[PDB]
Amino acid sequence: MAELTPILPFLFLGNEQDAQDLDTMQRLNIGYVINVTTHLPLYHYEKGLFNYKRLPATDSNKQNLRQYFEEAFEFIEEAHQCGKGLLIHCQAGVSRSATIVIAYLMKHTRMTMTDAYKFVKGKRPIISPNLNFMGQLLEFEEDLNNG
């Protein structure tokens, strides 16, 4: 039931239902979609209305998400740089996609992991990245701090 979450004016975090909301996506000037699942379709792909990126990840305790961080940020920045918005989602918008957004905030808005997490959780109370992903965020925080 959770509603689509505006994170930044050009970045929205949501779930599978939001990714199917064509009218809302266009109203929000979204021109890019990141689907963080291996199995969901890229909804509305055949319309050629958006640029898509799939990060084929599972929500398992062994899934490496860090490997997709750079690609996701580049795509968010591409949308950002051309005045467009980006919708990132997974199934529930709870673990996979939430992790990528928190990571983006850590690198591009220089927030500590805790502040980025609280920032996203404050806007989207249902987020709860799994512990494997939390460990990856901590490792990413250390890497950012060490340049």
Side-chain angles (χ1 to χ4, degrees):
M1 303 299 283
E3 58 188 44
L4 178 66
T5 307
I7 301 295
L8 297 175
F10 55 92
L11 179 67
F12 304 79
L13 171 62
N15 61 24
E16 58 188 1
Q17 308 295 149
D18 299 314
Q20 295 172 68
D21 244 67
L22 194 287
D23 290 346
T24 292
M25 300 174 64
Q26 293 204 295
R27 291 199 281 90
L28 293 174
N29 195 44
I30 287 171
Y32 295 66
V33 177
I34 293 177
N35 180 320
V36 196
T37 73
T38 76
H39 75 295
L40 298 179
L42 296 182
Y43 310 95
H44 295 120
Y45 189 83
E46 305 213 298
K47 296 183 168 58
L49 298 176
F50 310 109
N51 294 304
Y52 299 75
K53 180 169 289 292
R54 178 181 301 278
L55 302 180
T58 68
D59 186 41
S60 84
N61 190 56
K62 289 202 179 187
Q63 174 73 53
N64 167 356
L65 264 198
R66 169 58 177 282
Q67 70 180 130
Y68 299 117
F69 283 12
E70 181 188 60
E71 193 192 343
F73 304 162
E74 302 183 311
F75 204 57
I76 292 167
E77 277 306 291
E78 183 179 316
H80 181 194
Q81 294 184 66
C82 69
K84 286 279 171 183
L86 183 146
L87 161 71
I88 178 169
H89 74 90
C90 48
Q91 281 178 271
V94 167
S95 184
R96 288 168 283 192
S97 54
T99 293
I100 300 296
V101 170
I102 290 166
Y104 173 79
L105 292 173
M106 286 163 63
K107 181 186 178 64
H108 289 277
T109 55
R110 305 305 182 185
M111 295 186 197
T112 61
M113 188 279 268
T114 50
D115 286 336
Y117 191 105
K118 291 179 178 173
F119 180 92
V120 179
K121 182 97 172 155
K123 293 175 155 294
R124 185 175 184 80
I126 64 167
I127 65 144
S128 190
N130 72 45
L131 295 177
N132 163 39
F133 297 163
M134 293 296 76
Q136 294 179 43
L137 284 177
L138 272 177
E139 169 187 52
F140 182 56
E141 181 178 43
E142 299 178 51
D143 290 347
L144 281 172
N145 288 326
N146 294 151

